[PDB]
Design a binder for this molecule. Structure first.
Ligand SMILES: C[C@H](C[C@@H](C[C@H](C[C@@H](C[C@@H](CCN1CCCC1=O)N1CCCC1=O)N1CCCC1=O)N1CCCC1=O)N1CCCC1=O)N1CCCC1=O
Ligand SMILES: COc1cc(CCNC(=O)c2nc(-c3ccccc3C(F)(F)F)[nH]c(=O)c2O)ccc1O
Ligand SMILES: [Mn+2]
Ligand SMILES: [Mn+2]
Length: 179
């Protein structure tokens, strides 16, 4: 029974916690041992959900949070509908407004290193990339941050609140030196 797991359950939405647990167990990792990964997956899930909530009521198709098979099914449908290229790796969202898959990233480094890694992994940069950080920084492909600055500011504020709570529980240091 870690302090990090209890904090993750006390701070995040129950559906988010349940989805993070299912996702981690799908790839063979236990939320009760890899607690920093647990908090990281919960944070990524919440950030993608807030992102999809931004903009119109039906602009984004959510890809993260589904089962791997069903998410791949939804991306297959999206591509075979809109003609976009089938991404080599599973993204997080799809923008119907801009007709492009979005890979959302939350990092405890600089936006530069995580963005370079994600882009190196993306190869053919058809999928848009958008990186948020726990210090309020963000970086999107071609400086196209997709949403207006109010929702992105709401996401940054949520990230910093999570960070402050972790630090007040003295769990921020181990959470930072783990990515
Ligand atoms: C109270 C309010 C609730 C949020 C819920 C929503 C998350 C997400 C819900 C599930 C649906 C589950 N399944 C099972 C299979 C079919 C299926 O659909 N998943 C996960 C995969 C994609 C998806 O749809 N949904 C549902 C509606 C759209 C959406 O994104 N969201 C979005 C903001 C953060 C959050 O949690 N809702 C409901 C609508 C408005 C809203 O905000 N909360 C919780 C805390 C913050 C907040 O506002
Ligand atoms: C084994 O690896 C995992 C893979 C998945 C399925 C697909 N992967 C993602 O969809 C995804 N995974 C991460 C990530 C990876 C490692 C640690 C922390 C994170 C983060 F959530 F905190 F950011 N980051 C993203 O941006 C992102 O899109 C699911 C769970 C896995 O542990
Ligand atoms: Mn993802
Ligand atoms: Mn992502």
């Amino acid at each position: 029974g870690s302090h990090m797991e209890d904090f993750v359950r006390q701070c995040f939405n129950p559906m988010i916690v349940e989805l993070a647990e299912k996702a981690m167990k799908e790839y063979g990792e236990d939320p009760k041992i890899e607690t920093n990964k647990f908090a990281a997956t919960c944070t990524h899930l919440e950030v993608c959900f807030m992102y999809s909530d931004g903009g119109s009521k039906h602009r984004f198709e959510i890809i993260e949070g589904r089962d791997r098979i069903m998410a791949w099914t939804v991306v297959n449908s999206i591509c075979n509908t809109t003609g976009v290229e089938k991404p080599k790796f599973l993204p997080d969202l799809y923008d119907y407004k801009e007709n492009r898959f979005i890979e959302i990233g939350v990092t405890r480094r600089e936006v530069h290193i995580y963005y370079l890694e994600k882009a190196n992994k993306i190869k053919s940069e058809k999928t848009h990339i958008h990186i948020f950080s726990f210090t309020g920084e963000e970086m999107a492909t071609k400086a196209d941050y997709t949403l207006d600055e109010e929702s992105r500011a709401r996401i940054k504020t949520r990230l910093f609140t999570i960070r402050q709570e972790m630090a007040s529980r003295s769990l921020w240091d181990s959470f930072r030196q783990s990515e």
